Design a protein around this ligand. Structure first.
Ligand SMILES: OC[C@@H](O)[C@@H](O)[C@H](O)[C@@H](O)CO
Ligand SMILES: OC[C@@H](O)[C@@H](O)[C@H](O)[C@@H](O)CO
Ligand SMILES: [Zn+2]
Ligand SMILES: [Zn+2]
Ligand SMILES: [Zn+2]
Ligand SMILES: [Zn+2]
Ligand SMILES: [Zn+2]
Ligand SMILES: [Zn+2]
Ligand SMILES: [Zn+2]
Ligand SMILES: [Zn+2]
Ligand SMILES: [Zn+2]
Ligand SMILES: [Zn+2]
Ligand SMILES: [Zn+2]
Ligand SMILES: [Zn+2]
Ligand SMILES: [Zn+2]
Ligand SMILES: [Zn+2]
Ligand SMILES: [Zn+2]
Ligand SMILES: [Zn+2]
Ligand SMILES: [Zn+2]
Ligand SMILES: [Zn+2]
Ligand SMILES: [Zn+2]
Ligand SMILES: [Zn+2]
Lengths: 324, 324
C-alpha cells in the first residue's frame, strides 16, 4: 500500500568509485533555538560545539509541528509541511525508503520513543531500542537509572564493519531536553546552572530554576553532539563523514502560563517551533553548508539527506536544503 | 468540473423569518499590521475607525500568501492555507458559491484588478469593474485621474433595493496601499505625513519619505472603511449590518533592501504576511467578535462569512473565525 514519491531517484556516483559516505543524523528533542548561544542566547549552552571547526549553526529553522508524533514523520517526508498529514505518513515512501532502495545502509537507534512509523517498511533489525539498559550500556550514571544518548555511540564501529565500504546513514533519536523532568536529562558533570527545579509540577518551579535545568540538559546535548562528531572523526580517512542535528520541536517554559509542547500549529507560540539545527562535515567531503541565516524548516531535511548521498529526486529537486 | 466542499451546508434561519443580513467585506491591499495604530504603530493611521463603537482590531493575522493572485482565492477557499493550491483554486467550490446557492445575493465591486477566479462561477452581472471611470464616479479628485475606493459605495442603495429583504454580501476590492506609487493612492486631504516619495524607483526614496507616503495611503483606507460602515448604518434598521476588512498581504518597505511583495512564503519576510483585520457590527446583530489577540489567518475568513449568514458547513465546522 506504499504511495511512492521518488521512484525516479538516482545516485550519481556510487561507493565503489568514490569514498563511501557515513552520516549521523541526530534527531533532537525539545530544544529551543533561542536557548542556543550561537543564536544570541545570554548563556553559553554549546561550549564544546563552539570549538569544533566545520560546524554551521542555522539561526532560522522552524519545525513542521510541535510534537514527536507529528514532526518526526514530517522530517523524513517528501511532501513538505503544507501537504504532510500525520494520518497517512506511514504509507508514503519516505527518504529512508529511497536511500535504502539505492543501497545506503540505514540504522536507527532510539533513546526517546520510536521512529513514529518512519522505519516501519525496513527490516526490524535496522531499528534498535536504546532506552533499555539491555542495549544501552550507559544508564547507571545518574540517580534515575536513565539511559543516556551517548550510549547510542557504543558499538557503532561494529555497524560500520558489517557495512564496510557502503554508504551509511545512522539516525540517533535522542532523549535530549524532554520534559517535564528536565533535571533528569543530564548527568552531574552538566549541572552548571543552579539552582534547579526538581519537580514535575512546572508552574510551581521558580522560573529561573526551571530555565537552569533546561539549560543544563542543553549542555549534555552539546556534549552528545560533540562526541558524535568525534566518533565520525575516527572514520574520516575511509569515509566522507558529516553530522546533521535538528530538534523535533521546541518547548514552552512558562511564557503566558504555557508549558511543554504539543499545541496545534494554528495557535502554538513561537517557542514550540523555533528549533536549533547544526551541520558538521569534515574538510575532505566537498559538502558546502548554506548560509547560517537561510530561512529553513524541517522540509530541508529530505533534500539534505539525498544530497549527502549524491541522490537526486524530482519531487525535491529544487527544494532548499541545509547544504548546497 | 467543480470540486465541491460544502454540499452539506445549511442555513439555520432565513431572512423571511428574521432580519435580513447585509455584510460588506473589504478585501484590502498591501496594508501592514505593524503600521496600524491599534497594533502599536507610532503614528495614528486609523483616527476615524478609532472613534467608531463596535470596531474590533485583530493584532495577530497572517495572510495566506504574499500576492493578489495567491491570497485572494485562498481567502474564499474551504481548503485552508496548507492544502490550498493556487493552480486548482478556480475549480473548487468557494464560500461565495455556497452562500449564493443558499440564496445570499453576492456582489463584487473591484477597484484593484479582478476577483482572481473567485467570482467566475457566478453570473457576470455580479462582478463590476470600478477601476474604470465609466463605472466609478470618483476619479477626478487627484492629479492621476485614479478612481478611488469610496466610489465603490456610490449606488449601493440600488443593489439593496434590487435585493430587498434578502441576505446580501458585498465585496469591495480596494486599491488600498498598492505600490510602488504609494503617493498616488490617496487624495490631498490625506497628505498628512510629509515629505513624500514621489518616484517609482523606491530604493532612491529617502526611507522616511517612503513611509510617509505609505502612511498617508493608510489614512485614506481608514476613511474608506469608516465610510463603508457609515453606509451600512444607513441600512441598520432593516438589515443586520456588519463589515469585515482583511488585507491580501503586507509589503516590504526597504528592510534589508526588499521592496513590494510577492516573495514565496518559504522565504518571505514577516512584513509581507502580517496584515490588519477589522470587524465591525451594529449593536443589534447578536454577533460577538473574537478576542483581539486570537491567532488568526485568512483561513478564518470562510467560517466568518458562513457564520455571519447563519450557515454551517462540516468542512469548517470547528475552524476558528473572527467571530463566535
Ligand atoms: O499542528 C499540529 C501540531 O504540530 C501537533 O503537535 C499536534 O497538536 C499534536 O500532534 C496533537 O497530538
Ligand atoms: O508562497 C507563495 C507566495 O505567497 C506568492 O506570493 C507567490 O510567490 C507569487 O504568487 C508568485 O507569483
Ligand atoms: Zn563559554
Ligand atoms: Zn519531542
Ligand atoms: Zn516523548
Ligand atoms: Zn509525550
Ligand atoms: Zn497537513
Ligand atoms: Zn489533509
Ligand atoms: Zn487533515
Ligand atoms: Zn486527513
Ligand atoms: Zn542495504
Ligand atoms: Zn560536580
Ligand atoms: Zn490621533
Ligand atoms: Zn495585493
Ligand atoms: Zn496588483
Ligand atoms: Zn501586481
Ligand atoms: Zn499549497
Ligand atoms: Zn499541492
Ligand atoms: Zn504545488
Ligand atoms: Zn500543483
Ligand atoms: Zn440569489
Ligand atoms: Zn490641504
Amino acid at each position: 500500500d506504499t504511495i511512492y514519491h521518488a521512484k525516479d531517484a538516482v545516485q550519481a556516483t556510487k561507493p565503489d568509485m568514490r569514498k563511501p559516505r557515513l552520516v549521523v543524523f541526530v534527531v533532537g528533542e525539545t530544544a529551543r533555538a533561542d536557548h542556543v548561544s550561537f543564536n544570541g542566547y545570554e548563556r553559553d549552552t554549546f561550549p564544546q560545539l563552539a570549538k569544533i571547526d566545520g560546524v554551521t549553526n542555522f539561526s532560522n529553522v522552524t519545525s513542521c509541528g510541535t510534537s514527536t508524533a507529528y514532526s518526526v514523520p514530517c522530517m523524513f517526508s517528501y511532501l513538505g509541511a503544507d501537504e504532510y498529514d500525520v494520518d497517512t505518513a506511514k504509507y508514503q515512501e519516505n527518504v529512508l525508503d529511497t536511500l535504502d532502495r539505492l543501497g545506503v545502509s540505514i540504522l536507527w537507534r532510539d533513546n526517546n520513543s520510536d521512529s513514529k512509523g518512519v522505519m516501519d517498511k525496513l527490516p526490524k533489525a535496522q531499528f534498535a531500542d536504546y532506552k533499555s539498559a539491555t542495549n544501552n550500556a550507559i544508564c547507571n550514571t545518574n540517580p534515575y537509572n536513565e539511559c543516556r544518548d551517548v550510549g547510542m555511540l557504543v558499538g557503532l564501529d561494529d555497524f560500520v564493519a558489517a557495512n564496510n565500504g557502503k554508504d551509511m546513514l545512522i539516525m540517533l533519536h535522542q532523549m535530549g531536553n524532554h520534559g517535564p523532568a528536565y533535571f533528569k536529562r543530564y548527568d552531574e558533570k552538566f549541572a552548571k546552572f543552579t539552582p534547579v527545579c526538581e519537580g514535575n509540577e512546572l508552574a510551581k518551579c521558580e522560573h529561573q530554576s526551571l530555565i537552569n535545568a533546561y539549560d543544563n540538559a542543553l549542555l549534555a546535548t552539546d556534549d552528545f553532539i560533540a562526541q558524535s562528531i568525534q566518533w565520525l572523526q575516527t572514520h574520516s580517512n575511509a569515509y566522507d563523514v558529516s553530522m546533521l542535528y535538528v530538534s523535533d520541536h521546541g518547548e514552552s517554559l512558562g511564557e503566558n502560563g504555557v508549558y511543554l509542547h504539543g499545541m496545534p500549529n494554528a495557535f502554538a507560540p513561537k517557542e514550540q517551533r523555533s528549533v536549533p539545527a547544526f551541520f558538521w562535515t569534515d574538510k575532505q567531503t566537498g559538502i558546502t553548508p548554506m548560509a547560517t541565516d537561510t530561512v529553513l524548516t524541517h522540509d530541508a531535511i529530505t533534500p539534505t539527506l539525498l544530497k549527502l548521498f549524491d541522490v537526486t529526486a524530482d519531487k525535491v529537486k529544487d527544494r532548499t536544503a541545509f547544504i548546497r
